[PDB]
Ligand SMILES: *[C@@H]1O[C@H](CO[C@@H]2O[C@@H](C)[C@@H](O)[C@@H](O)[C@@H]2O)[C@@H](O[C@@H]2O[C@H](CO)[C@@H](O[C@@H]3O[C@H](CO[C@H]4O[C@H](CO)[C@@H](O)[C@H](O)[C@@H]4O)[C@@H](O)[C@H](O[C@H]4O[C@H](CO)[C@@H](O)[C@H](O)[C@@H]4O)[C@@H]3O)[C@H](O)[C@H]2NC(C)=O)[C@H](O)[C@H]1NC(C)=O
Ligand SMILES: CCCCCCCCCCCCCCCCCCCCCCCCC(=O)O[C@H](COC(=O)CCCCCCCCCCC)COP(=O)([O-])OCC[N+](C)(C)C
Ligand SMILES: *[C@H]1O[C@H](CO[C@@H]2O[C@@H](C)[C@@H](O)[C@@H](O)[C@@H]2O)[C@@H](O)[C@H](O)[C@H]1NC(C)=O
């Protein structure tokens with residue numbers, strides 16, 4: 001069947017303004033294993049995004065880690081948009097430093 | 100204990116189109132990758148060859164190179180003559196090491212995300228509840244004894260053998276200790292007046308970790324531990340939320356125990 005992705009977006013280090021960091025987008029629990037993942041800075045797409053090889057858990061569902069380099073600021077908001085057959089509209093999960 | 104897994108994932112879209120990409124792991128750390136478009140199996144670690152010689156490795160690699168093309172070709176034919184007429188298939192194979200050079204080997208196949216066949220002892224086996232039409236294929240395949248002897252060598256023999264080699268070869272990587280850095284934050288909850296304190300802990304290795312909201316020495320047992328989330332530099336991310344009455348934040352600390360700290364815990368105060 002079609003299992004839909006769950007998406008998590010978390011920094012590598014404690015985020016601090018003006019300070020280079022890494023932003024992870026862990027996508028999980030989906031099937032089939034065909035997906036486009038985008039990472040966004042202020043709605044615009046980030047071209048430079050590196051990705052783990054797709055793998056799957058004991059429970060057969062696939063998971064993949066995307067990450068990019070980013071300098072968090074007061075104003076720049078970040079997110080992760082996922083394209084996937086199990087879903088009419090793309091999902092978008094906004095980075096939230098406080099969360 | 101250590102689980103060694105070879106995960107294969109193959110998609111068939113058409114009869115024109117299909118691809119197989121594998122990745123293998125030794126617990127946390129990936130040892131290999133093998134893309135459909137690469138003719139050979141990449142090493143994601145310096146020790147990904149374990150102890151086997153170039154000879155011995157290449158022997159095993161040739162065997163997989165044959166298996167991959169075969170698997171594809173066989174499955175495509177299985178597609179033609181089948182079901183009424185219906186693809187995503189997955190293999191998880193390997194072994195689990197134990198104190199006394201003991202292990203249980205395994206090989207499971209999932210079709211359309213559902214577990215359907217495993218290899219057990221000497222023959223392939225449709226698992227209970229699987230579609231009837233697999234019975235025949237699984238029998239035909241069981242007529243090819245070469246592949247059953249082959250598969251038995253790989254499970255009973257090669258798996259423990261190789262993995263033992265990996266454990267020695269990779270020792271420093273698997274016994275790495277990487278220290279967690281921790282930070283605090285909070286967000287409002289649904290409940291009015293209530294806030295959610297969060298304890299983010301990132302960069303630790305190995306996985307097992309302990310993160311508790313404390314008030315002095317009273318373990319705050321409302322502490323809810325999230326899922327373990329992977330960083331890309333092969334370390335772990337976890338966070339623990341504690342919901343609280345506004346102002347009830349006062350005098351609270353989150354502490355973290357972890358192998359890598361000796362026994363000198365981290366203790367961010369709020
Ligand atoms: C590789 O290891 C195999 C076992 O290991 C497991 O499976 C592998 C693939 C991994 O997953 C590993 O981690 C697992 O632990 C090993 O298979 C074993 O070998 C023998 C011979 O092939 C099998 O023995 C025969 O069993 C049947 C009855 O089986 C039933 O009952 C038993 C227990 O009571 C259960 O295990 C089964 O589920 C069945 O319900 C006997 O009737 C039969 O006796 C007859 O045949 C023999 C000929 O050998 C004669 O001597 C007798 O007189 C009888 O005529 C056998 O005793 C054993 O079942 C099988 N284990 C399993 C799991 O079924 C395989 O041989 C190894 N191969 C190599 C190349 O190293
Ligand atoms: C196994 C783990 C051991 C550890 C090894 C360490 C190194 C690993 C690093 C590299 C990772 C490899 C990635 C692959 C994943 C591992 C899976 C292990 C598979 C072992 C296969 C052995 C190959 C033998 C072989 O090539 O046989 C050949 C091809 O057969 C297959 O396709 C095997 C398919 C197995 C899957 C069954 C389908 C499951 C249910 C389907 C549901 C839809 C035999 O060809 P043949 O010549 O016998 O065909 C003619 C038939 N005949 C003789 C009757 C006339
Ligand atoms: C056959 O399918 C090809 C590949 O399809 C793509 O890959 C699959 C796994 C999905 O990700 C799917 O959404 C993609 O489109 C096509 O490019 C090809 O044109 C198709 N041709 C036929 C015979 O239908």
Ligand SMILES: *[C@@H]1O[C@H](CO)[C@@H](O)[C@H](O)[C@H]1NC(C)=O
Nearest residue numbers: 115116117118119135136137
């Ligand atoms: C996978 O590899 C085979 C041969 O290496 C090739 O013909 C096939 O088209 C590849 N898969 C895709 C979708 O490129």
